Write a protein that binds this ligand. Structure first.
Ligand code: TUO
Ligand code: HG
Ligand code: ZN
Length: 256
């Protein structure tokens, strides 16, 4: 099935998922001199104080930290969004080297990794229904650069040993996603898609200008993960990022 390798990677995806060549695919390059400040944007509201993490899973592509979304506990609202979007999970995309790994790029600049906090529009009842709607999802994207360690990330880093291979999961309760945010909530926003198959065009992307810094040892542990299942030949989980897709005269707006 689909992956990130030469034989199942991003330019093979269109065969099983024709929408890969669609009109609002993600990620995209953010050309900072083409993005326009939008005064009609409300401030962004990230309410993660009552977030309830459930567990962490290696899905053979990346790892997901999953949250209980059966109540309004961790919500995204404001900015370009109408109504309330509930946090369901977060995950990352990263490279084999610090000079690559992010999915969105900024004036062609690739970051070492990208964090995606995935939220679904609560007017649709559940995630499965939300992904059938053009405004079903909101993904908050945060760039990672290598520098000082991010203390709020370390609990995630520590558990990765326990979920090395495809299909492995571990209890991951009481994780506070507030520890992953940069200071500034300045952002760019554009309408887009899932960056993974089925590549559904259901996403309002909100990409934060300010990156977080993570340590070299933190990222190195990400790179120790496996794409393969236990007992299979080792295929390191690295370069699990889709490259930038045609903007196709969508408009990227800036909050600042
Ligand atoms: N990880 N399992 C999933 O079902 C999944 N759901 C997603 C929703 C949104 C996005 S996104 N990257 O465009 O923010 C990704 C996912 C995923 C997923 C994420 C990483 C690897 C494989 C699947
Ligand atoms: Hg959709
Ligand atoms: Zn993602």
């Amino acid at each position: 099935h689909w992956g990130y390798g030469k034989h199942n990677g991003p330019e093979h995806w269109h065969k099983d998922f024709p929408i890969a060549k669609g009109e609002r695919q993600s990620p995209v390059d953010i050309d900072t001199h083409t993005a326009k400040y939008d005064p009609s944007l409300k401030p962004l509201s990230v309410s993660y104080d009552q977030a309830t993490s459930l567990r962490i899973l290696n899905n053979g592509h990346a790892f997901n930290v999953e949250f209980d979304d059966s109540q309004d506990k961790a919500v995204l609202k404001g900015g370009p969004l109408d109504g309330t979007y509930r946090l369901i999970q977060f995950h990352f995309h990263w490279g084999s080297l610090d000079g690559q790994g992010s999915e969105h790029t900024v004036d062609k600049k690739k970051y070492a990794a990208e964090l995606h906090l995935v939220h679904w529009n609560t007017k649709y009842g559940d995630f499965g229904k939300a992904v059938q709607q053009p405004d079903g999802l909101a993904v908050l994207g945060i760039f990672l650069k290598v520098g000082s360690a991010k203390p709020g990330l370390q609990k995630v880093v520590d558990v990765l040993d326990s979920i090395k291979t495809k299909g492995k999961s571990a209890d991951f309760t009481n994780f506070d996603p507030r520890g992953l945010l940069p200071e500034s909530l300045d952002y760019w926003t554009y309408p887009g898609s899932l960056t993974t198959p089925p590549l559904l065009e259901c996403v309002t992307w909100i990409v934060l200008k300010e990156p977080i810094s993570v340590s070299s040892e933190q990222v190195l542990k990400f790179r120790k993960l496996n794409f393969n299942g236990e007992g299979e030949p080792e295929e390191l989980m690295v370069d699990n990022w889709r490259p930038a897709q045609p903007l196709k005269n969508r408009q990227i707006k800036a909050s600042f």
